[model samples]
Target: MLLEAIFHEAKGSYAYPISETQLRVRLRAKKGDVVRCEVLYADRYASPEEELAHALAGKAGSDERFDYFEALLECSTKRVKYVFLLTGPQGEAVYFGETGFSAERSKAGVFQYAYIHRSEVFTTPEWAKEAVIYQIFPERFANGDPSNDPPGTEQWAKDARPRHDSFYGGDLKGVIDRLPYLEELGVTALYFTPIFASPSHHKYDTADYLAIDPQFGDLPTFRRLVDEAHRRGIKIILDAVFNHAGDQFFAFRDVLQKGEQSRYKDWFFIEDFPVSKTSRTNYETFAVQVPAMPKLRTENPEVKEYLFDVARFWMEQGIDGWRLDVANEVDHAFWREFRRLVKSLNPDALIVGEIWHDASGWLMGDQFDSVMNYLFRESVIRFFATGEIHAERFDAELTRARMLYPEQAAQGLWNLLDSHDTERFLTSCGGNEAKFRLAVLFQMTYLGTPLIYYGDEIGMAGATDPDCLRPMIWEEKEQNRGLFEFYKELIRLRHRLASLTRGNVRSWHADKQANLYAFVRTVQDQHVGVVLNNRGEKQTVLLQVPESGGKTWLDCLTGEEVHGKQGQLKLTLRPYQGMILWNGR
Candidate 1:
């Protein structure tokens, strides 16, 4: 029998008015003199609100959800039942639900649980492990049918020189038309930046969540585009913005008009002191210049419902999942509810948050399936490829990230060398195609999903921002098509090598003398090794093979072959060269 358990918070903090939360398990337990109370998180890091852990001390509350959340311990001597609870700092407890009351556990005699955990805090997106993701900036990829471009915004913003806000004619039809090209490139999924209706081309200042920006094509066109993408076996992931709304949103308008009387005014983070309608300096900005974008209060139940509806709406349209924009800035309350509701709609649906920091806390028990791994791309490109940071740190950081993150989260990260938000990979590599190839090799062969920015394969070069968002250079085939072919071949190897795509990675050497690094990934009986030389000088590395399973291994990139004998493998690597060796046992 399990008794009621509650959580409480520590007293005294710099902040004022702290609150406590409690969670109680409500289940029928057999009366026993000794009842065992065991708490189990689906994953050890199951508490999404770790920062709020201070709130979960000595709280006593009743919750139906918490009642069933905990699992009962059954043994030969005792008939035991238990439940779990999630509490807050204010001693208010919300029931998470009951566990261990399953038919399988009773039949099997013992619960053999399988879960993904991070010894440290690194986690990856689970769905993206084998996926070859292609990222597109809606305005720049292509002008497939040009006729659908927004009418008034084409003229460059005369003042904002080299305007990133300028709208290009790129639309869903263009993306749909390019499916064959993407298919040939071996991309498995497409992630587009926000496409909701907005005043700006980026659509971050969303004016309408329900309507597609006419510039990107209407809902029907989007539906057709998704269907077309699905027909080719490619998944689609749309950007979701729930943290803020454009001033044009109805909820914001209500706040602007009714002040306290506004039904939706409380849905935003407004100051207690009211701003007079006449004051020019009345409104404080969210960041400094992004004034039109008002912050949304996700703690409101209405906001949660609306965002969940938005998620369900897209899932119904066949989108695989959402890449939530500015995930760290949003309310966790909304996320908790959103996860439940979205999963109810579609179990296989993915939720990848746009967070740059450590997100091991985000992926436990499927809160977010993945995240845009900007940290990896930024750090590796800056340190390894650009030589800005010490090469030794590159290997150390890469391995550190691997060792720090959970296996599931590590597998789910979107590893990329470049994105529309930054300088193109080729431009950043100073036009050194070898180094660029090395960067691609690192991203593609790493222990996560690989993402390719549009036009990277064909050697597109742009410095930053609007420049990075340049139109795809379809006519550059003669100049860099070979590189594109090389990319395709790497993709081919990734698809074929189970170890490379879906395996456990162990770092034999992430950095062997600053310029050379290697690691091996194994899945079942398959093993693949990646050796990279980010330096300009050729070097021969004597690699001590950790396992003795392979007799022959071939470098798929350089067509070089080597044999593994007597627990050792020796290979000569070229200047700025990399290799993916598949062990043939």
Candidate 2:
């Protein structure tokens, strides 16, 4: 028996409250080791001898090294105590618990879940799960008003190779001017990078959290943009840069002027005495060690309150949510406080963190609602863009990613192909329209809410950072009109199907040899199937529909009707092609 391989923890994906009275528990053991796993659980205060036998959730999330077994325990009381009974290879049975493992059942100490607090349950906005969010870098999206343009604004260009200092004069008014376009695209939410006061075009270095950047327009312009977006039923999410502030910020400036004697000296990290433009190595700054951006002392009580005030001020001013920049650098306690404050005002408001790696530590029902899912981005790049991994490996990678969160957070994940910080997805696909379309089809049909980075639909291509953050294309003749149409149709189809948003997903088929992957999204009797041929040559696939009853399925993409006999449907797909089939008839 591989006793060390078996593991379980108290909270997060391992064992967390799904709701007020439902407890979700997952246990891991060596792959192909355990044949049967069971959760012998009971109320925490109840007699240990009267344990009930709860059925195992069968291993999902299995990978090369381990098999993760899950169980959802229903708590009769508000409390729960559980222990696992494992029957491993050769039917050798053992009892496992918090204390350790033993062959004698009575000696294993059970893990206690003290109580299921309603406030602690990982509840998120119902609308977020159904959202198709569009991320826009405000300065690069459009140029609606020349009056508010910065002094050194560059001329607008569809193919401008941007430098860090380049600005295209895009502002809030520009976004306001494009409300009709967004409404037509069917995205329910818009996530703008930053609009706060900063010297840089990308407002990541915030000078004043309370003030809107002057070049981006004043209060009236922002208010008008919010009202216009709301009019079109689009929720606005602003980027929060609490991890650091621009050196021009008042407190940082005060510290520089008065040294340690300044009352606001504690607002930032002052490594040594008086700071200077050149000798600025004394104080802590953002990762690049650039003294122009000073890292905030978030742990300081006063600084925490000030940042909290900024969050409250914007939330009250009509913004729907926040996307925290560099969320990983901040302390966990600070986020807990922020979450409490935000939820108190509006429980439905979303809080997304910019965490590029595993973020389960923050999504433990008390912090962020979701995060920028770079993990999802990596797998998409591997399977679709580069074809470095085939269908079998792709499915396995996705399974591991999905198992990283509670089911509640899973739906709210911002699944994106690319963001402001990375190269465009089309660029990753080597500008192949067919490959890009296949990825788009998968994105629309996947489990999480799809996040479309601005300008992706019109076939924009760029490398990283300064290259990817180019101005949005507006001239219809210059844009890839055909690609835009494809995006519009996919968005429409995703919105039309209920199964895509409110359903469970199961792998219907995955063939490494043919580079074909298939999955079914089901909500009760309603079903939608997504099939993709991620190959350079034509491929034929046999899809095995689960629980098929000779139901007629419609190929929503091709406008053709198909039916499977005895749950098997044969399909012939063109190279780099994808199809969406739904059981509507």
Candidate 3:
């Protein structure tokens, strides 16, 4: 047995509370090395002789270095103590615990979960679990009230790309006008970019936290928008830019005018008596030292209190939640307080952060409920958009991603293909509609909340930011009707099937060289199996689905029915084709 190749962690993806009653435990071993693995677990208070044995499900998603095995256990007693048992092909077995691999099972050095307190259990709002989020760049969504357009607004043009300062008269009323459109599209949540008062079109730099941008609309208009959306069963989430302030922000202005005498001097980091305009100030600024944007000293008590009030004020106005901007840069202490305040206002209010990478720290049942899942974006771009990775590697990376945080946080992630910050998904694939279709199919079926960037459903395509933020294509004749209908169908299917949102995810099959992948979403007996062939040529694949033996399976997308027997499914998929098969009574 390769003892040194085995590993596990007591927290994070390896071991985490999936729910108040369930705990997921995982083990990593050398790929293809272990023949079988099992977990021995019991309530920490239980006697050593009372531990139970459970098999760990092994899959082909691990990288070249390791193979991943997982087991989901129901700890009704709210505590768990566990260890692993590994068996090699030659029938040699070893007991793996916290200390090391040993031939004898001993209580000492055993890995244990001290407790699963309800407060410490990661909890995301139930609404978000099955949510289909639509992200809209407010300045480009629509022109319901052109009279409110900002100065120098230009005529709407399909071919026109947006600049940093460009505005096309999109506002709260525009969103209000399109509530029915969004309702028909089956989107349950609306995530709008910064709509607070700001000079720029993308309002990341905030001038005022309390006031709404006149270009967008006033508070009353926003209130009406929220009420309308809620009436249609849609939730609204606004952006919160607590990391920095625009050059004209009131507090920053005080520091500039009063210099050393400014009572608000601690609001920002200013080392010099007078702030510099041409030269780099001895103070922290956002990005490339731009004079218009300055990083807020969130560590300051006054600044923290001011931002806290902004959060509380918006939640009280009936907005569903906030998508925090530059969340990673802010202090952990601040986010903990932010979470407490937001939850106190409304327990279901979500706080999603703009975190791009590993989010274990922010997702420890305290700081953030979810985050913008750029890791999902990166893998999708690499596999479906660029073909930089084959199906096997894609499966490996995806598995790694799911295991990065607790299961609850993973489910609540805001998964997106492209956003206001990245190149459009269609552009990423060089206008390959087939690739975009496959990417969307995977995103909708996979775990996490599917976030649709504005205009993507209409086949709108553009390069990275400035271009990606163009006006939405509103004309039906100019829009890609096929793609739009495809998106609608996908959303409808997701809403119809509870398993896709509430099921356990596992890799059913994958073939690297053939560019084929298959996975199943299973909730009780309702099983959804997705298979994809990302190659230019037709491919034949066989899937071993033990749960489907003697069951009739329906192709949910194509409405075709097939019989499954002897635990095997044979499929022939055309180039760039995918299928969603489900067996439900």
Candidate 4:
């Protein structure tokens, strides 16, 4: 029965509440070992006679080591007790419960999740599910207000990639001027980098938390931009860098001037008296001993009150929400309060954090609604950008990654290929548009809120940080119109297809040597399947289609119809090709 191969946990992703009334529990066993599994569950307080059972089927992961089995229960009372009965191919059986595995099911040793609260279940903004986010580095997006240009501004036409000190004068007005362009591209939300008053062009180092950077315009201009965006059916998410403050921040300036005598000294983590700048300073900094930016002592009462005010002030000013910068570095206590305050102001306001890996800790419904999915970015890069991994490994990695968080949190995850901090996706692929297109196809069809860096849709290319922060190429001659149109088409499909937004995901097939990967998304009666052929030559593969009488699958991109008989479908794909197919019904 492979008893040692069976694994189950009652917390985290293994067991979680998908909704107010639905609790999803998962079990894992050796791949191809268990033929079927049945979940016996009931309200923890219910009598044994009142227990209910449901059958569960196994879904193969990319790796041959384990097969995942899931059961979603409707817990009317918001309480659950469950156990599993696993049957082998040869009729061998095993019973699994809270205590351990046994030859027979034990009612006395069943697992119990005592209660579920609506407030504890992670609730993302309902509007975010259907959103396609456009991430903008304001300094590089566009220059709408030339008069507000900062000193040493470079001519946008002369340079595509700018240095760290260079500023192309992109501002909120530029975003306002380009609203129609974003609308045409079918973006549903805008996630901007730090726009608060700061010295650097990126603006992550905040000198004044309440005021907008003059380079980006004033609060009035920002309010207008927010109103214009909302009127056009687009959301605005500003960056919040609360982990630290710039050296020029009023409080920090006082500490610098007053040294040991400053009343605000406790607001930051100072290692010793008289902070040093020339050498490794005693005060803790963001990355290293960078004297320009100092980490804030979030545990202090004054710091907490001040940051909370910053959060509420923006919400009151009509800003939608915040994209917390380096959120993992901050203490959880602060975020718990931050979430409460922001949500109290507007329940629908979103809070997305910059967490790069395994975001299970922050996604517990108390901290963040979502996080920047750098794991998705890394996997995409390894497969499509660098070609360092094959199809099977890619699928395996994705399977494990998605299981790190609850399905609901997975839906609102910020999926991005590149950002201001990394090299552009196209550049990462060595300018191979075909591979880049494949990545885009997978991203659009995958679950999560897809985010497009400003110039990626138009084929902007650069190596890394300073180089990747390039000025917008607005000229028709310089832009890749084909790629832009492709992005628009994908965004349109994402908005039109409900299954792509909130559907259950399962791997349909993956072949390592063949360079083939496919998966399906199902929402009730609707099903959408995506197939990718990453080989250099044409490839043919067989897929298992849904069992619907006389149903034909329609290709979204090519308008081709496919017929499946006996639930088996064969498809031939070209080199570097991808397909998005759905049942015609």
Candidate 5:
């Protein structure tokens, strides 16, 4: 088969062939022994060449390696039939075709390649495709264990009534004690805010990286957190903020005593200037004007070594992955080495960055496994909620996003409705519980891994920032029964339908005038239909399903029937409600 590196619309399709002499293929393992060639190309640095180049230069997959050779093979075998056989030799296994390459390449040479994850005996790439993550502000999840609470912790956190931004003794031990609670909620992963030691309870302004906040307990406690989480089949990803450090950090201390002449002066973006008469020293932020969060000079080899070691240290402690904070703020030099260091620690571990824009440019292959998908979230919410959307708007935005990154890169983007910094999802949905449920409905069934802000499942309402980071209320189920059931059913549908979790998003429609929004995600034999109505009345929709198989499909939520027979299907949705209809039977 010949490899051509050109852009294609779908996963298993061929774009164009680059050269005749040298054919290259890209592959990704799907589930078991099966692998698909995603793309193929001939020349190394042409139109399609840059696409593969994009993947090769950053960290992706388990080995932090891109599928360059596999991209070529994928281009050649798009709609073709092939099998891979991996055989053990010494300590490694070599994979080859079941049918020899020469014979297969002849007929399939003109056919497109099917991309798949490769290497034998590995965890399913399923984790990236189908995961529901809950991002917890540790001090807000649950206070299951109180002994781990720090002495005079109240002085550190800045809030009254022990409310938002206040520590109610939430710690790693609390997380360990509440594993079952998380599992029961159907969350597959936990993305904790920076748990490292910091003066602020929020921990963004970190004081130390090597030690867990004394308030959160010790190293053994963190180890137990990982172990307990793993035993329950829940993955744990830590927040890594290498771009900047708190002023209280040791490097900043050096800046304090020696002033501009200090050897550690290069540790930050601090300018050589006069010092104030006050006893305390103020370091500069990454930006020239802001000094609260000093921008770390990651370009320093020493700083690089120390940060890389910190990442590896946690991986060695059995942490599953890392969610990098302000990843783009760091220099490319540091990220390149950081990616290598993280992957060296754990090949299967996933690395995600906090970049809200087009992260593909910074995250081709060696840099990040994925970036937090803020662009998608912002646009989707803008379209559906707040009456700000129009026809074809969702499609237009998503199309732009799809074009921004390679197919694999697009797949790694993390999906979330409300994170720690934004307004809560409920409030973001205009304070309508049903609309909020629909927003989550979209999040739970979208393309990337969906992240639920700590208390989103219970209809938590807050305006912005600190308000959005309110403590999860376990006691409010009685007050908000409808909201609670809505989320539980949404989670139920997410887990029950493979199409929702593993399917490809077909089309999204959001029209504020009609107050109707619907999207479809379809797997092989099953398809899920999600419809949300925000108006004060029920609406009937004429569905133009991508794939149809009559009304035999079942509704994932209500367990009802949604048949698409006689050329079309009639769907009736209530005001401010959502539904998921799958293949009837």
Candidate 6:
């Protein structure tokens, strides 16, 4: 084994206490170098006594460079110490600990975990783990009340292309009116893109944190929206654009007019005496040269308090949680305070960050529950949409994504295929309904919260941003019935089966030659298997399902029985077809 490549730290992503009585620890080693890894732990305060050994499970995620192993440390004591035993393929051994690796186990200096502190324990809201989120772009979803529409708001173009700076008048009342539709679609949560007061169509540049965009509705209207959504058992997660403020925001407007003399000069990043639009760097904005949005100095005491107050006030208003925009740009210290404040208000409210890439650093339980999960989206796009990657690469990509964070965080991750910022998934599939269905099947059956981009359920297609943010299809004849029913049925399936939401997930097979992928989820006796054939031709799949035993499996979508011989399960799938089977009711 390459001892130097192996690493483990007792803090951050490597080790953390999920609860006061249990600590989750992770170890990383050179890929394919270690056959197995085990942790030998003992309470440090007690007599040497007998040490306990736990074989760590392979995370199954490898960057092709490193593999990860992790296990939970259930602690009955205040303090515990441990060392790692690594076994190579050829039976070679190495004992590792705080002082590094050694040939002798006794000489491996022990790593000690300080007494567990209840207040310091990391946790995410349990309700978030099973959420099937629906992301809605308010301005484009639907227009329930035209009276509140902006003067020149145009009519919705169901078949026409969307344009920037144009509005179709989607509002709070619109969402309220569609509660039944959402209920029928079976979504458990709604993630609305910024509805804060802003001049632009997209409210990422927040003009006011407290006020809802008049175009959307007033506070009372929003309260009504929340109330109505809650009545139907739906969670509401609003976008928090605290990283930047609209240039027209009171403080920024004052800065623009008063320059250095402005008392609010420190609220934002200003280069010199007078802020100028002539230079991109004159004031730190959301992008290189967007004068309408100015980045806020979240670390500033006044700024921090204001943002925290915004969160607390919203939590008080009965919102389920917040999905922070450009969260990585904000200081970590601010997020720590944000977490404590939000959790303090509603312990069950989920706090998700909009991190498009590696989010391990932010999902440590001290910051956010999980990120938007764009890495998962990227993988799904490659395998199901573009055919740029095969089953093996796709499986590796998913495994790597799931293994990046703690198990709890992974479950709460908001897995999105498309959002307000990206093109629609169906469009990405080049209008191939089969390919899109394959993607949806994977999403509905996979771990994490599957985020249904607004119009995706009805098979709406569009390109980036303005186009991607299309109007929801309400007309029965205009909607894609096949896709809609698939979404609705899968969501119902997901809700009925705990394995699809909170169970253990393991990939059984990934065959590149056949373009096939198979995985199974198990929660007690509820054993579910999902097989996806991405090929254009019919194919037979023979997979080794260790837990098959003599149990008969029932196809979920179709009421067909599946029988396995010994430990091997056999099935034939049509072109781009997916099958979901379970052995338990």
Number of the predicted model whose TM-score against the real structure is largest: 4
Candidate 4, poorest ten consecutive residues by summed lDDT:
55-64
Write candidate 4's Cα lDDT for 1-585 as tens digits: 678888777877788887787888878888778888878888888886774756464553535367788888788889888888888898877788998888877732778888888887878888988899999989888788998998888889735558878778999899999999999999989998988998876677899999999988899998999999999999889899989999888999998889899999999989887765576688988998788889999999899999998888888878777899879999999999999989888988999998766778888788899998888899899999898999988888888777777777888888899988889999999999999999999999998889999899989999899988888889978989999999999989888888999887888888899889999887887888999998878999988765762357888999999989788899999999999998753
TM-score between candidate 1 and the true structure: 0.76
Local accuracy of candidate 1 as per-residue lDDT tens digits, 384-438: 5578765556655664565334455667778888777788888888888888888
511, model 5: CA deviation in Å?
5.4
Candidate 3: pairs in clash: none
* Candidate 6: regions farther than 4 A off: 48-63, 277-281, 547-550
CA RMSD for every model? 13.0, 2.1, 2.1, 1.8, 11.0, 2.1
State the weakest 10-residue window (summed lDDT) of model 2: 543-552
Q: Higher-lDDT candidate among 1 and 2? A: 2
Candidate 6, residue 563: how far the Cα is off, in Å? 1.9
- N/CA/C clash count, model 3: 0
Instruction: Give the TM-score comparing model 3 with the true structure, all chains together.
Output: 0.95
Worst 10 residues of 1 by lDDT: 10-19
Superposed model 5: Cα runs more than 4 Å off: 1-125, 144-165, 259-261, 273-284, 476-482, 508-513, 545-551
lDDT of each structure? 0.66, 0.86, 0.85, 0.86, 0.62, 0.85
Clashing pairs for model 4 are: none
Give a tens-digit lDDT track for model 3, residues 440-520.
Answer: 999999989999999998999999988998888888998998988998998989888888998868887878889898888
User: Which regions of candidate 3 deviate over 4 angstroms?
Assistant: 45-61, 74-76, 547-550
lDDT of 1: 0.66
Candidate 4: stretches off by over 4 Å: 1-5, 49-51, 55-64
Better of 2 and 3 by lDDT: 2
Give the better candidate number (1 or 3) by lDDT: 3
